[PDB]
Design a protein around this ligand. Structure first.
Ligand code: F3S
Length: 58
């Protein structure tokens, strides 16, 4: 499933783009995945919009 790696911080950008695919952890200390098998371009915008490009279709 999609992964935001660990190096990621918590910009919440991907969450602000697709909070249905990527949501804040328990404390927002890391971007947690919600749709480990989405099917939208949100991943494209969630990645592009992501400067840390920690999001990958691993
Ligand atoms: S920094 Fe982390 S919170 Fe989303 S926007 Fe890039 S995976």
């Amino acid at each position: 499933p999609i992964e935001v790696n660990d190096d990621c911080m918590a910009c919440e950008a991907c969450v602000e783009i697709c909070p249905d695919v990527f949501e804040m952890n328990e404390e927002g200390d890391k971007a947690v995945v919600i749709n480990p098998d989405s099917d939208l371009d949100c991943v494209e915008e969630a990645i592009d919009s992501c400067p840390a490009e920690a999001i990958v279709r691993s």
